[PDB]
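Why run this: before we spend reagent on co-expression, it is cheaper to look at a predicted model of the complex and decide which construct boundaries make sense. The entries below are exactly what would go into the expression plan.
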Amino acid sequence: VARYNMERLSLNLKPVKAFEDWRIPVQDGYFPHLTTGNGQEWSSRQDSTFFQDIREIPLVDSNYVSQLEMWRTHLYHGIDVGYLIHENGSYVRLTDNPEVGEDYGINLVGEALEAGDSVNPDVYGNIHNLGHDFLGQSHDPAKKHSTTSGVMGAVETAVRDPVFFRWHKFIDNVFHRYKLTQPPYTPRQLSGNITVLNVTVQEEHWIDDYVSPENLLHTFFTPKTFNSS
Amino acid sequence: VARYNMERLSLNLKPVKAFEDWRIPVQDGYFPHLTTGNGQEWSSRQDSTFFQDIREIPLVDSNYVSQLEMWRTHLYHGIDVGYLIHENGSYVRLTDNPEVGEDYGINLVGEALEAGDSVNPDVYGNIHNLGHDFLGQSHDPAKKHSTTSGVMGAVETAVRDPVFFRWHKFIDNVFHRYKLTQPPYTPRQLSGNITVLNVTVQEEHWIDDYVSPENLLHTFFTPKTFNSS
Amino acid sequence: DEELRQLFYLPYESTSTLADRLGIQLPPLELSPTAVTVLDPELKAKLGSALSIPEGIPFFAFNKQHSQAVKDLSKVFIEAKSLNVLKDVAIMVKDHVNSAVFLAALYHTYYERKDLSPGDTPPLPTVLPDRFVPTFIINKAKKLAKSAIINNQTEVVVEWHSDETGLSSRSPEHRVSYWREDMNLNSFHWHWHLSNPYYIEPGDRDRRGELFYYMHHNLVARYNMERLSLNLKPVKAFEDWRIPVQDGYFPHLTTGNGQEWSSRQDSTFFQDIREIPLVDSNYVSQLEMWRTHLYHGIDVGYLIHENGSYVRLTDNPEVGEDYGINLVGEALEAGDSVNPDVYGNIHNLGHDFLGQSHDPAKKHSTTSGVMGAVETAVRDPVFFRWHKFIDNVFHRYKLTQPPYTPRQLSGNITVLNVTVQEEHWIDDYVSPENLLHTFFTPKTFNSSSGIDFRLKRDDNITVHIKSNFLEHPDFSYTITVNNPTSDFKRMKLRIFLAPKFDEEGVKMNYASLLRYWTEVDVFETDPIAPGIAYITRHSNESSILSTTAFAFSGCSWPRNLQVPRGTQDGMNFHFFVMATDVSSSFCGRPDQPIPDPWPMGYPLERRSSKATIEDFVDEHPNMMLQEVTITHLRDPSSVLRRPISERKECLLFTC
Amino acid sequence: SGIDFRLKRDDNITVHIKSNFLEHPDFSYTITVNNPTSDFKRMKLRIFLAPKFDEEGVKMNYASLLRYWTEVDVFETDPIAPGIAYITRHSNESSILSTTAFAFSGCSWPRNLQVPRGTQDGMNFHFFVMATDVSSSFCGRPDQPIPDPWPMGYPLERRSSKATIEDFVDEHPNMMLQEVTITHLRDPSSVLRRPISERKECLLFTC
Ligand SMILES: *[C@@H]1O[C@H](CO)[C@@H](O[C@@H]2O[C@H](CO)[C@@H](O)[C@H](O)[C@H]2NC(C)=O)[C@H](O)[C@H]1NC(C)=O
Ligand SMILES: *[C@@H]1O[C@H](CO)[C@@H](O[C@@H]2O[C@H](CO)[C@@H](O)[C@H](O)[C@H]2NC(C)=O)[C@H](O)[C@H]1NC(C)=O
Ligand SMILES: *[C@@H]1O[C@H](CO)[C@@H](O)[C@H](O)[C@H]1NC(C)=O
Ligand SMILES: *[C@@H]1O[C@H](CO)[C@@H](O)[C@H](O)[C@H]1NC(C)=O
Ligand SMILES: *[C@@H]1O[C@H](CO)[C@@H](O)[C@H](O)[C@H]1NC(C)=O
Ligand SMILES: *[C@@H]1O[C@H](CO)[C@@H](O)[C@H](O)[C@H]1NC(C)=O
Ligand SMILES: *[C@@H]1O[C@H](CO)[C@@H](O)[C@H](O)[C@H]1NC(C)=O
Ligand SMILES: *[C@@H]1O[C@H](CO)[C@@H](O)[C@H](O)[C@H]1NC(C)=O
Ligand SMILES: *[C@@H]1O[C@H](CO)[C@@H](O)[C@H](O)[C@H]1NC(C)=O
Ligand SMILES: *[C@@H]1O[C@H](CO)[C@@H](O)[C@H](O)[C@H]1NC(C)=O
Ligand SMILES: *[C@@H]1O[C@H](CO)[C@@H](O)[C@H](O)[C@H]1NC(C)=O
Ligand SMILES: *[C@@H]1O[C@H](CO)[C@@H](O)[C@H](O)[C@H]1NC(C)=O
Ligand SMILES: *[C@@H]1O[C@H](CO)[C@@H](O)[C@H](O)[C@H]1NC(C)=O
Ligand SMILES: *[C@@H]1O[C@H](CO)[C@@H](O)[C@H](O)[C@H]1NC(C)=O
Ligand code: CUO
Ligand code: CUO
Ligand code: CUO
Ligand SMILES: [Cl-]
Ligand SMILES: [Cl-]
Ligand SMILES: [Cl-]
Ligand SMILES: [Cl-]
Ligand SMILES: [Mg+2]
Ligand SMILES: [Mg+2]
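The model came back. Tokens follow.
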């Protein structure tokens, strides 16, 4: 996300905005122009498409916007009070100053948010993964039209979609929310025996008759070719 | 529902309107002014309250408006094509002209809609019962406020609420939708050996020095008293 | 010339590929910047704008530039000194023109040249199967073909079902997809617009604006009868253009150039089309003002000509005066409009607004949706919402007309009786009188005239495509009439169909039925001798049909969709018959005027003081109102006698 | 009389203002009645107008027509002798009018708007007539009571079990339902005979 924003600033674009108010339609759609080797063209998403309940087939496998919202509410609460509730009933402290043998709070939040090895799936849910699927199925969320998923549904294609970065700005916002609850590093936590005296950056030779001034880096476009056979 | 409407017409009120577009807030609220013997006052519902997803505690026990809508969509489909799909995969014909040993279509729809002995809970759901609970919890649908349920949540109190009859007008509309799919009764189905020649209605004596004209009935208000001890 | 017909074949392949396969002698060739015909400068100079449409996109029939290109190309074809020269010109230009534009120009040419018959054109699905068959099925066919060739198999059949393009259980509009996507109906739509293009030289058609109204009115009416048969509500006009289009459509179609047709999500707004270039744009409020202007003209009874004079609108015209319905049609389509700057181009542009609504500002480098093409537009449920709006405009105009006078409805012939009888179609069953059936039957066609499935030149491969269609048994009807006069009388019988009940089970009154009447048969009889006569017509003779998966050729209402679906229990229809005193009727004839001076659909497109169709018919001895039942059979063999042993007992007399 | 258009005192200037108005020719109607009793009877005739069809071309039922009935003439007649009588009223005598661009003075329904516009082809109206047993009527009289005890607009402002105005009127011998056509002329001279030479041929009997 950070590097994407640096690219946006380079292009006179505004930094990406989190998609956090899920009752607002996603302003920017995306048409991937991709077709799989089985002849299946990836679904697109029109501008101004709502993030909507996914009514699966079978219906019992469905997920809902307000369900994800309540997972989010629960997770925000845990972050704000500094502990998660384990499915076994005990409380787990969140801290990035852990004791030896204690998990890092950022790690616990990450496992709960992705979700992966969550301390409590029933309470904190599966926000980030399902969000990909809500966005990827938003062109046909009740599965009425016998369609394919959009690129947000697959790891090798999701980054293509501008909404990837709106979704991940939301995700990064959750993580930063947690980081802000942590106390600043103490003098001892930042102290060191080595003094830094100087820093210089130098671009290597890349074109005859030009030597880059110190502390200047360049970028440009170059063709690349590969064998698709 | 029919008798309620006759009471409404008697009072110069418009007949009850089904609550069917669940996007529209319920215009008329209800304040029951009831308190249980455990001192727990029944929750009320303000005018213009939305029918909203019920996020239960625990969250895994929740139900959602679009979920009920999809159950409704599935049921409307079955009604319109004249058969339900059994959870065992077979199709069950809906008819009010059944073969000997065949269920009545109106009965099958009723069991699916209530729901009771539904042919397919996963597909047709539990629309009518859950709707009572959605309406009864609509003052606090995400259970944020540690509140009690409204009167729609209990059989001995639900009829008090004007929304009971809006909900049941919707329910009766589903049943009438099914009835309309049935062929008109044939001449043989309506024929009879007995001829009806005359009909007369006569109110009994109820007050001295008055005899009601034929075919005239009266109503009035009278007190009744009971022992609450 | 069956050499002429060959020009329709393999439209996505080079002329060299076609000629090689067919042994057609080629003109001189060269290599384009592969082998392509040399295009003579003399021919090129005659082509107008034909070459301006790039290869690799569909023919967008409602778009003014695309239609102009087809008109410009067909002009050269139509004006060719002979059929030999025509063939030479076609062979020469084929490599240099958009293939869909080429095909459209060729079909139009058969309608316009007097020495060609549209009935001799190939069925459109054999030429462009990609327009009618889902992407997945074409791709499966390519796979089956590749395997077959490898295993020395010269023929393959692929098939598909409606269960595969949408989910009926969650999408009520999908319940009628079989009808909207019917390949013959979509082909009929292509034929209609190429027989009666809005860009035709004015005068070269008679009452073309009125025919635009009439064919589409019948198309909408029959769709509604299909909807009622399926327990769907009749279609609602898309008229408040502020409201998003509720039902989207995903066509699941890909052109032979690999370009998948755009879809439209549920709840998509009808939005301003900001074209590239921007100066070619059109706007919702612009269309709304055209509509406002047209409604005004209709309401006051005259249009304003671009020359400043006023033109009266009347369906009771003087000799030599145009019909008001025709003038409104030309203004609305639009075709030969009296005032383009004032009344605009509402209907055509609306197709393009709907077809581009997934990307109306052209930000996403996308293709158009199916509403943009005549051979695909009927597939989309919004087609019928758009055409219900269009039919509403026409009905708004019809309602301004005075009811037909007694003299305008009077006739010398009396109608005495009407009977309808389904022909034999299954052994050991005879249909009761006045009962018609429908059912689904498979049809198969050879797609190899349209798509080259060969891997290499020497491969012998044929791909057959099989799918299900609504169908009905043949039927006939007999009208008993009396001529009480002293001499022979000739008459035209006018027979129309409409459901008796609406979606609520209420009997439709006269006013409501006006929106439903559809032509069954309108034709002139032999002269009727004094006394009683019996006139019998077979369903294959119907005026709405022309003259093997494709029964009727050229421009024809699909024979297989001639009878509305009806219901399992039997659905009741009015069968109106009128005897009036004196090549599908929906298509008209390019070279001849409409023979009948009465408005199309007469007398059932005007208001009446009569409340019911029963009351209306009872006033006139030359009209009779008959009634038929139409019953859809899920399993046609169900009509057969069942073993006494296997019959089940009913609880309530019938079951 | 309303605006002083003078520049200075001695100027002699008059400004006339001309504009177009809807208008109609005078008309009369005659009601034929029977008094079957043995003595003179006085009655009030109550005459109301409404369109027959709504905007959709559907015949309006009794309930819908209640929203449309408008007074044409409501007045008391001379006593009617036993037997048949003819009662003729001129449009200028209408109860809705009082008693030169301004025909009727004081408080009056405009005489020029006494007849609805109607249409070029002719528009059909119910003309309801009731004989009841015994200064615009819209304005009343400041110093006098309403003479008639019946509600204004009687009997056509209440519900009926009768579905149509036809059914309603058929129940009562003292009511009759007549019908008139009202036709608007863009060019009043169009009603005149046209030269045989200048008449154009119709395609469908009438044009
Ligand atoms: C399927 O359709 C195509 C028509 O285009 C047929 O292909 C032709 O077959 C004949 C006989 O082998 C060849 O001489 C022609 O060259 C073919 N035409 C083309 C354009 O390839 C094919 O025969 C049809 N298959 C069947 C079974 O009728
Ligand atoms: C137009 O109207 C006014 C009425 O106010 C008339 O003006 C009067 O004319 C007479 C005769 O010249 C004068 O003696 C009065 O003093 C005028 N009254 C006022 C208030 O100015 C005028 O005569 C009318 N014109 C015509 C042609 O009738
Ligand atoms: C819940 O699991 C954690 C694992 O770290 C454990 O420390 C805790 O004791 C458990 N709670 C109970 C009461 O079992
Ligand atoms: C520097 O090094 C010492 C010796 O290893 C270490 O104990 C201490 O942490 C460091 N002190 C500072 C100044 O950070
Ligand atoms: C750091 O290095 C740069 C260039 O090598 C030089 O300009 C600067 O004087 C150096 N600073 C120090 C403190 O050595
Ligand atoms: C499903 O249940 C019905 C109930 O009568 C039964 O008839 C049918 O055999 C069952 N289907 C299967 C395949 O088990
Ligand atoms: C009349 O009675 C007979 C004898 O029981 C019975 O068969 C029949 O169904 C009855 N009803 C009619 C309408 O015939
Ligand atoms: C029905 O009963 C009433 C009162 O008993 C009587 O007045 C009327 O005439 C009866 N009708 C018939 C058809 O017997
Ligand atoms: C191609 O196969 C068909 C049978 O499928 C056969 O009739 C025909 O002769 C074959 N074509 C050639 C050129 O062999
Ligand atoms: C405008 O066109 C109409 C078409 O018939 C013609 O009659 C009329 O003369 C034209 N108006 C003028 C003033 O040119
Ligand atoms: C009947 O026939 C006569 C003679 O052709 C013709 O004039 C008349 O228009 C016909 N129709 C009627 C209804 O009189
Ligand atoms: C009409 O034809 C049917 C069947 O042919 C017959 O039963 C019926 O009586 C006929 N009606 C008249 C009026 O001839
Ligand atoms: C009517 O047309 C269909 C399809 O072409 C055909 O099967 C049927 O035999 C035809 N009926 C007659 C008698 O021509
Ligand atoms: C009716 O009044 C108008 C306007 O005042 C007048 O022109 C007409 O002569 C009057 N009719 C009679 C006969 O009084
Ligand atoms: O996770 Cu959201 O795509 Cu790396
Ligand atoms: O069910 Cu809804 O309350 Cu009797
Ligand atoms: O015109 Cu036939 O498609 Cu709108
Ligand atoms: Cl949603
Ligand atoms: Cl499901
Ligand atoms: Cl919970
Ligand atoms: Cl531009
Ligand atoms: Mg509602
Ligand atoms: Mg609308």
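The helical segments of chain B are 2-10, 65-81, 105-114, 121-124, 127-136, 162-180, 187-190. Residues 1-183 of chain B form a domain with the di-copper center containing domain from catechol oxidase fold (CATH 1.10.1280.10). Bring this page to Monday's planning discussion.
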